[PDB]
Amino acid sequence: DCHLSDMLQQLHSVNASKPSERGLVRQEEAEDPACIPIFWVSKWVDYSDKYGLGYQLCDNSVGVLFNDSTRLILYNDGDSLQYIERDGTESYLTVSSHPNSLMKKITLLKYFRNYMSEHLLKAGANITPREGDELARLPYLRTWFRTRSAIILHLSNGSVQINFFQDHTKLILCPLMAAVTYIDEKRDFRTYRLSLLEEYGCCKELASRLRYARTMVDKLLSSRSASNRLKAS
């Protein structure tokens, strides 16, 4: 069991209950703005052909998941770097003092940073994130994939974000809060506790997106299971 299997349980329970078919859908009663996330992906660039997936988190930190499965994260101080090897070791470096071996990758991260700053909007620019406590470290991108309709971004804090290309709607799912934040086409946002959606129901729009979210989470879980099987030999 992991963040993903907990999320799948949460989504299965709300979805099984057919929330848009409740006698009186009381979607507003399920809102819990206190559970807004601490982190989400505000910008991304898919350079996966050659290099990796670059992204900005809502605190203005940036990171990259490189094709060789290493990661580089740059804090919103603009100088502190965290590098993660394939096998998980974190090294703490800085833009000003770092091993020359990482020149190429640090240069790539700067390219993403600068590209995103020049060209891309900040998702959830109108959202004040939740304040994280002692242990709420900067997460990084655990894995991601794209479908015809969406990009799916899974962070190391357990959150799963799904951004829909067609209509710019977004979901941010957190298995710790057991909550979902939905950003609609007007960029209005609401956060819901999943158990309250099961209790009170919701509109067809949100219900459909939660069905898609479950499908995506099953995909993440199967990949995770596969890589764990390989890892355990």
């Binding site: 891309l120 998702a123 990009i151 951004n163």
Partner: peptide
């Protein structure tokens, strides 16, 4: 290949 511009 990128988020909203």
């Amino acid at each position: 290949l990128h988020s909203t511009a």
